[PDB]
């Protein structure tokens, strides 16, 4: 066995996805050609991504005591994720999202916090042992802010590393004090646009956007630029990482794969450059497929691409 070097705290959802010819207009009933139900949520997705890439992973999230919660746990373990630290809350509904997708790819999403919204800064104290010994710690913005803050404080207290995915941006000022406690931050084009006000329209403006993030507490900024690669910005360097050429199929939650892959290399003490490249390759393989379950990138697939 292996000590848990990566700690992920974040949301657990059951995603109900439907494919249809046309999205329903207000007041309209339409037909869909099919649907699926699978594990979802920024927390569980990133934790799974770390697991499929070989990381020693400890995921902490909450499901309800209901049929969707039993489904979320059953999937995560089918995905090699130990659910020992996943809270089961009786008298709350499991978080869950409604995803409607039409032929052209346009979609509408609606998310119910469910068991994710029950986290308090006090509930985090129970995991301070696991957090304090974790080499890197992944957060998102799909759980209550006081709970994310409590994790970030604990990490600073132990002198660890907080990787923050600032997604969804939400209240930008409310996350200003979360970013201050983060050690690494990985915004995409939109998120960096709201946090700094600078739209990363090209590589010169994206470097200016990253240098503004250096002023807010993070020491490493990794601007996820989608099809145009990634930009690593620090006080001491700026390096563009060329995107990997792949057949694009479904680009949803590629960033979630990116953070996971980065966190696995980081937990392995690989040099920072190798960490960014491992994340960018994990994201590249994540677009070549549909979904982030069994189709999530593995170490074998990623390293062959590299």
Ligand X SMILES: Nc1ncnc2c1ncn2[C@@H]1O[C@H](COP(=O)(O)OP(=O)(O)O)[C@@H](O)[C@H]1O
Contacts to ligand X by CB under 6 A: 188, 224-227, 229-230, 243-244, 246, 248, 251, 253-255, 258, 280, 283-284, 287
Shortest Cβ 102–a copy of itself spacing (Å): 7
Which residue, among 259, 257, 230, has the nearest Cα to 242 in the 3D structure?
A: 230
Query: In DSSP terms, which residues pair with 137 in a beta bridge?
Result: 7, 162
Which residue, among 46, 108, 9, has the nearest Cα to 255 in the 3D structure?
A: 46
28 binds a copy of itself (CB under 8 A): yes
177 included as an active-site residue: no
Terminal alpha carbon distance of the chain: 27
Q: Which stretch binds a copy of itself (CB under 8 A): 1-9, 80-88, 230-238, 264-272?
A: 230-238
Which of a copy of itself, ligand X, Cl ion, none sits in contact with 224, Cβ below 5 to 8 A by type?
ligand X
30 binds a copy of itself (CB under 8 A): yes
Q: Give the residue with the Cβ less far from a copy of itself, 50 or 134.
A: 134
Q: Which residue has the tokens 């119910």?
A: 112
Helices marked H in 166-202 — which ranges? 176-181, 189-196
129 binds Cl ion (CB under 5 A): no
Residue-wise over 105-135: b if at least 16 C-beta within 10 A, else e? eeeeeebebbbbebbeeebbeebbebbeebb
Which residue, among 9, 38, 253, 6, has the nearest Cα to 143 in the 3D structure?
A: 9
Q: Give the residue with the Cβ less far from a copy of itself, 217 or 226.
A: 217
Exposed, middle or buried, 102 (CB in 10 Å: 0-12/13-18/19+)?
A: middle
Shortest Cβ 73–Cl ion spacing (Å): 8
Which of Cl ion, ligand X, a copy of itself, none sits in contact with 289, Cβ below 5 to 8 A by type?
none
Task: Kindly list the residues in this chain that would bind a copy of itself in the complex (CB under 8 A).
Answer: 16, 18, 20, 23-35, 37, 66-68, 71, 74, 93, 96, 98, 100, 102, 106-113, 153-154, 156-159, 168, 176-177, 180-181, 211, 214-217, 219, 234-236
């Amino acid at each position: 066995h292996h000590h848990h070097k990566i700690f992920v705290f974040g949301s657990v959802n059951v995603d109900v996805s439907a494919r249809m010819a046309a999205l329903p207009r207000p007041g309209q009933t339409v037909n869909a050609s099919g649907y699926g139900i699978g594990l979802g949520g920024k927390g569980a997705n990133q934790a799974v991504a770390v697991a499929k890439l070989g990381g020693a992973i400890r995921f902490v999230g909450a499901v309800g005591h209901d049929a969707f919660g039993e489904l979320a746990l059953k999937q995560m373990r089918e995905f090699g994720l130990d659910t020992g630290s996943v809270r089961v809350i009786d008298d709350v509904d499991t978080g869950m999202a409604i995803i409607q997708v039409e032929e052209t790819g346009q979609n509408t999403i609606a998310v119910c916090a469910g068991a994710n919204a029950r986290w308090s800064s006090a509930d985090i104290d129970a995991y301070g042992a696991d957090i304090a010994k974790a080499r890197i710690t992944l957060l998102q913005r799909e759980v209550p802010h006081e709970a994310n803050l409590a994790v970030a404080k604990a990490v600073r207290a132990a002198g660890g590393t907080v990787l923050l995915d600032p997604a969804p941006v939400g209240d930008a000022s409310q996350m200003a004090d979360l970013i201050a406690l983060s050690d690494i931050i990985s915004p995409n084009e939109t998120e960096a646009a709201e946090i700094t006000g600078i739209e990363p329209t090209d590589l010169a403006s994206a470097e200016a956007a990253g240098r503004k993030l250096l002023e807010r507490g993070p020491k490493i900024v990794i601007l996820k630029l989608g099809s145009r690669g990634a930009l690593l910005v620090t006080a001491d360097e700026v390096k563009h990482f060329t995107p990997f050429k792949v057949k694009v199929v479904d680009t949803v939650a590629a960033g979630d794969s990116f953070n996971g892959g980065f966190a696995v290399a980081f937990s392995q003490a690989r040099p920072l450059h190798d960490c960014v490249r491992y994340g960018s390759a994990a994201g590249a393989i994540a677009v070549t497929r549909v979904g982030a379950g069994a189709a999530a990138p593995t170490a074998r697939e990623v390293e062959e691409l590299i």
